[PDB]
Design a protein around this nucleic acid. Structure first.
Ligand SMILES: [Mg+2]
Length: 59
RNA sequence: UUAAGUUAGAAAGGGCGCACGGUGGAUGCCUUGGCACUAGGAGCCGAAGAAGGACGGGACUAACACCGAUAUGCUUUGGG
């Protein structure tokens, strides 16, 4: 959270993209039954949320 | 032995009493919920989109509760 606030808006935007891609691949693996660490999903969801929050605080 | 006479016992099933079960949810005990008030506060919400909803959100989710594509939560300030 404090680490996110360090980054620029554009850099956060790119951090989101990565997390969105990560979340997508987790959901993919999960559906194909190839995901063990299913707790990863919630973390990534929360992370995305956190990043959007900081960006909206910037404005 | 014949004759005459008298009387017993019997239960297919049934009755009464008793014993033991079943069913059923009365009664007692209990209380998560109600009822009536008192004192104090407050008596409004809505185009800055209401009341009330629908559909969604969990690793798996039928329902309830919570939340809204930032979805079973996000940030922050305090408590602990
Ligand atoms: Mg704290």
């Amino acid at each position: 959270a404090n680490d996110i606030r360090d980054l620029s808006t554009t850099e956060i935007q790119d951090q989101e993209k990565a997390l969105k891609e990560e979340l997508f691949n987790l959901r993919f693996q999960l559906a194909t039954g190839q995901l063990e660490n299913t707790a990863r999903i919630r973390e990534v969801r929360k992370a995305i949320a956190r990043m959007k929050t900081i960006v909206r605080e910037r404005e």
